[PDB]
Amino acid sequence: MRECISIHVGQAGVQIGNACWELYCLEHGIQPDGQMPSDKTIGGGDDSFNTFFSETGAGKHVPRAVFVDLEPTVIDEVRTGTYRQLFHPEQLITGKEDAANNYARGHYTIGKEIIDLVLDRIRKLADQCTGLQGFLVFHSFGGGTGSGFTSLLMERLSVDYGKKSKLEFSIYPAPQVSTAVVEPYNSILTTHTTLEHSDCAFMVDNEAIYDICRRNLDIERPTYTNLNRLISQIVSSITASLRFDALNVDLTEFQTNLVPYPRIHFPLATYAPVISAEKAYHEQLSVAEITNACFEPANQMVKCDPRHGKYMACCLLYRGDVVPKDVNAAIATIKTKRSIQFVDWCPTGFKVGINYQPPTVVPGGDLAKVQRAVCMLSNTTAIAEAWARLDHKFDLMYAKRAFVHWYVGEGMEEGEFSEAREDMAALEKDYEEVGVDSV
Amino acid sequence: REIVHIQAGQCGNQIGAKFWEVISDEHGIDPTGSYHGDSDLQLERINVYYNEGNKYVPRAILVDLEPGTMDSVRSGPFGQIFRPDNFVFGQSGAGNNWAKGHYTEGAELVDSVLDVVRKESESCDCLQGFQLTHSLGGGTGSGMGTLLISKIREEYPDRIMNTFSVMPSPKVSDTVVEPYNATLSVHQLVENTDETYCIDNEALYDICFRTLKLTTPTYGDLNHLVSATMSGVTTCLRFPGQLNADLRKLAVNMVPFPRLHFFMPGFAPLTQYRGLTVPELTQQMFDSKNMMAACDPRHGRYLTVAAIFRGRMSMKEVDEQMLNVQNKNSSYFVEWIPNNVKTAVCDIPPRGLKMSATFIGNSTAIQELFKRISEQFTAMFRRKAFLHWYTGEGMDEMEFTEAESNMNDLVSEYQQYQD
Numbered sequence A: 001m002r003e004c005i006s007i008h009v010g011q012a013g014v015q016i017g018n019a020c021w022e023l024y025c026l027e028h029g030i031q032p033d034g035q036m037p038s039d040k041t042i043g044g045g046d047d048s049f050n051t052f053f054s055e056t057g058a059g060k061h062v063p064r065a066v067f068v069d070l071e072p073t074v075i076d077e078v079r080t081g082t083y084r085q086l087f088h089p090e091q092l093i094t095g096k097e098d099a100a101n102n103y104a105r106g107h108y109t110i111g112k113e114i115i116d117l118v119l120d121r122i123r124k125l126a127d128q129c130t131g132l133q134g135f136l137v138f139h140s141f142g143g144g145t146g147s148g149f150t151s152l153l154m155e156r157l158s159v160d161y162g163k164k165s166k167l168e169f170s171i172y173p174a175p176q177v178s179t180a181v182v183e184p185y186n187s188i189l190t191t192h193t194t195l196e197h198s199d200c201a202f203m204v205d206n207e208a209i210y211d212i213c214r215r216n217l218d219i220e221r222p223t224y225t226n227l228n229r230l231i232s233q234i235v236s237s238i239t240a241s242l243r244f245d246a247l248n249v250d251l252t253e254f255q256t257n258l259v260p261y262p263r264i265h266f267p268l269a270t271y272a273p274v275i276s277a278e279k280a281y282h283e284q285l286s287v288a289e290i291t292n293a294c295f296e297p298a299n300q301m302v303k304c305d306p307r308h309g310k311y312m313a314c315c316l317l318y319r320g321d322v323v324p325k326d327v328n329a330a331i332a333t334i335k336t337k338r339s340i341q342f343v344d345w346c347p348t349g350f351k352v353g354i355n356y357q358p359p360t361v362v363p364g365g366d367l368a369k370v371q372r373a374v375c376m377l378s379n380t381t382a383i384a385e386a387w388a389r390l391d392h393k394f395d396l397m398y399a400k401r402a403f404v405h406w407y408v409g410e411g412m413e414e415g416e417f418s419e420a421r422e423d424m425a426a427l428e429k430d431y432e433e434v435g436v437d438s439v
Numbered sequence B: 001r002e003i004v005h006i007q008a009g010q011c012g013n014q015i016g017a018k019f020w021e022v023i024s025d026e027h028g029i030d031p032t033g034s035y036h037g038d039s040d041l042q043l044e045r046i047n048v049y050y051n052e053g054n055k056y057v058p059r060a061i062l063v064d065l066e067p068g069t070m071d072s073v074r075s076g077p078f079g080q081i082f083r084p085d086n087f088v089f090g091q092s093g094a095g096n097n098w099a100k101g102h103y104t105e106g107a108e109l110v111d112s113v114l115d116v117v118r119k120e121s122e123s124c125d126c127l128q129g130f131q132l133t134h135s136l137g138g139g140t141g142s143g144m145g146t147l148l149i150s151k152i153r154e155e156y157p158d159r160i161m162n163t164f165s166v167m168p169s170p171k172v173s174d175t176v177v178e179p180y181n182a183t184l185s186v187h188q189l190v191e192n193t194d195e196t197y198c199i200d201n202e203a204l205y206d207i208c209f210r211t212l213k214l215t216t217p218t219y220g221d222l223n224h225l226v227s228a229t230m231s232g233v234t235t236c237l238r239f240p241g242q243l244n245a246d247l248r249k250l251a252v253n254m255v256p257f258p259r260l261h262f263f264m265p266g267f268a269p270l271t272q273y274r275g276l277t278v279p280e281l282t283q284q285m286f287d288s289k290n291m292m293a294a295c296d297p298r299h300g301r302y303l304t305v306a307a308i309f310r311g312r313m314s315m316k317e318v319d320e321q322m323l324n325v326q327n328k329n330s331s332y333f334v335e336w337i338p339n340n341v342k343t344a345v346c347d348i349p350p351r352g353l354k355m356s357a358t359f360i361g362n363s364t365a366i367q368e369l370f371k372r373i374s375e376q377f378t379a380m381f382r383r384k385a386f387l388h389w390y391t392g393e394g395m396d397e398m399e400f401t402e403a404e405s406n407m408n409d410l411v412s413e414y415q416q417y418q419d
């Protein structure tokens, strides 16, 4: 019950979804053929892992997700990858042409071709579910598939599934790994479009993840593989309440607390401890250490200063050998030392959950296995800085209407650009309003 | 005079389950429903909460919008004793939204539940009324609970309605939106309950943390004080004696004015082999640190008070202690209600205690509790924070405004009489 269908749009979506799924197999004891020896129930069951993994007569535990990419290349490696047996052919959907980094191409010119087939596969998965809970969409703002097709699929899911949940894992563009000059355009436009169709959006800045790997993992030039593996750890901590089940707290309750107002649905995420296998050897990280780490600004997935802003919610999702008592101490300590300012309308509390299932690392990973990890999600107004930066780039190119012709030829109109930007400016003012102290 | 017990939601189902276990022990009923008590007292009024292969079955209906909570109870020690048909739950869950329970996803199951209730009420020879357990600050029992109360009141408008309502607290909170759910529930109860025992999840913690010295109290800890308090208040109903209290008489003697039906429970010994002295029990019973509501009686004035002492003890010494308290604390007793305090003694002591004391008081101090909730509501509601989760269900800010107001009036009323 409470099944979740996972949707992975674009190259980034797809790859990050291959990271995640592998880690989830490793955590649940699912083998690459899908056979989970631990699971005695064959063809079905009600286990937490069944919300993300469906079962078959043979005992094979198929992932509940669909990989869509307008170029075959990325999903092709999945088709031929180690976990190719786990997935099912229909679940992998690939066209023949990419959106050449163009939102317009991916939303209209190309997307329209595959959109109906995609929704079709989702619908099949939806019928398998006894009580579907919502969708998990993974994409990148910068790419044409990750922006234009992703918004299209968001609208379609709104219509066809009504107000069912729709969470998101949006890859904030990072100049270090930038692939297109026009990525700020696609970012604004997709953010504008999906803002009304997303219940809760988690952004991950490639730059921030790139830094974390170089620093904590001592990687000279982190690859998309490094990022993805770190990303999957974050994702797994967030979804761990769903896939696993006394102290564990459903992410819904966190959601009811991380969205004070519909437009404010972007929470910041900070994970700990990211450590190399040498450094983790002969070092034990306390609940207090990992907890500090959460409040450390260099450990956050998005680059922003929480101090510059105010907290509207702050949740701590732990996993591993943790006990309430230690979590209470560490929190208090933090308090004594940190400046966790809260909006006046919001209660200055930390919602916690402890999932005793310990964390797992993919073999050959650069992440050392730890006995405890934590990932704090916070609704601080600092997130706006993000938008700003982006927006500012968008404004720079758009004043000289650069690359704008590429959008217009696909059929878009400058109105869409200006409208999208206005909405971002409103969102930024909304953050400022929520921080203002009550009269 | 059977009492139809009804437990809704996680909290409601957890505390109610222990309550059954406790009173089953005292009444010598094991998990299978068979009886092995050494005294007939146990069987003399067992029908107040049980129906009889010479086995007693609790007269309890379990209600939840998610199976999990009810499935745990079924797996619990006494899970067998609870009648299987009385288990009544759905799968949607209430996502901690009064709305989702009082409007959207409860309107369905409510009917199913009313049917079991109807069945229990039919078998009952003389229906005393209904007993309900729930957490005012959640979703199923906060919202759906108050909905069932209203439905129940329409079908059985001649029956007493009593609720053990678990006031939410920041110390033990689950969601930021708990004040909202509490304020809505409070107003429901003000109108559709004759008796409401306010069990603040705050105090319980405190007691545990401070007094009982528990650094990290779990929900079980709090529940343990709750079950004890429950057994206390319900003693006079369960066990025969000089004062065979009943729901109606209980309301007739402790409720000077309708809206004022909210009581501060108190228990001692707050748990031990050293039985307390009748003076000790009496000083702890009225001790703030022994009340399950987080209000100071000294800050208000006792409209009415009712005490019970279980266990072998000197009835005379008991009466002397009570008299002393009243005489030393005359200022905390309303003059306009002559003889506003009364005590009763039961021979059968609580389980594992040589003797105990339970306190039930309609103190004007109870307003503190509602003021706390009202401030919270005000804080968030001034900025409309999180309101979209309710507006999405079809609710309207006006309704939040109304409930906010009513709870303020009720606070005012308690003060008026206080002064």
Ligand SMILES: COc1cc([C@@H]2c3cc4c(cc3[C@@H](Nc3ccc5[nH]ncc5c3)[C@H]3COC(=O)[C@H]23)OCO4)cc(OC)c1OC
Pocket: B232, B233, B234, B235, B236, B237, B243, B244, B245, B246, B247, B248, B249, B250, B251, B253, B254, B304, B305, B306, B307, B308, B339, B340, B341, B342, B343, B344, B358, B360
């Ligand atoms: C503490 O003990 C209890 C007292 C009561 C109330 C009650 C509450 C009061 C009070 C007196 C009485 C008393 N009223 C009564 C009734 C008939 C009489 N006949 N002749 C005399 C006489 C007196 C109880 C006898 O029945 C009740 O339900 C009544 O003074 C201010 O508050 C209910 C109980 O259940 C929960 C209870 O257990 C804990």
Ligand SMILES: Nc1nc2c(ncn2[C@@H]2O[C@H](COP(=O)(O)OP(=O)(O)OP(=O)(O)O)[C@@H](O)[C@H]2O)c(=O)[nH]1
Pocket: A009, A010, A011, A012, A013, A015, A016, A070, A071, A098, A099, A100, A101, A102, A106, A140, A142, A143, A144, A145, A146, A147, A171, A173, A174, A177, A178, A179, A180, A183, A206, A224, A225, A227, A228
């Ligand atoms: N973190 C992370 N970011 C990625 C990854 N792969 C691509 N990106 C980011 O995605 C952006 C490009 O997005 P894509 O996924 O390739 O775009 P697309 O979805 O294939 O759309 P097309 O232009 O039509 O091919 C770049 O700015 C990268 O920073 C990844 O594997 N991990």
Ligand SMILES: Nc1nc2c(ncn2[C@@H]2O[C@H](COP(=O)(O)OP(=O)(O)O)[C@@H](O)[C@H]2O)c(=O)[nH]1
Pocket: B008, B009, B010, B011, B012, B014, B015, B094, B095, B096, B135, B137, B138, B139, B140, B141, B142, B166, B167, B168, B169, B172, B173, B174, B178, B201, B204, B219, B220, B222, B223, B226
């Ligand atoms: N004393 C006590 N309080 C509880 C318990 N379970 C939940 N609560 C409180 O109930 C409130 C949340 O309501 P919940 O039980 O989850 O209601 P539901 O939607 O119907 O399940 C929170 O304030 C908790 O403080 C319990 O077992 N004992």
Ligand SMILES: [Mg+2]
Pocket: A011, A071, A098
């Ligand atoms: Mg591509």
Ligand SMILES: [Mg+2]
Pocket: B010, B138, B174
């Ligand atoms: Mg709950």
Ligand code: NA
Pocket: B092, B105
């Ligand atoms: Na429904």
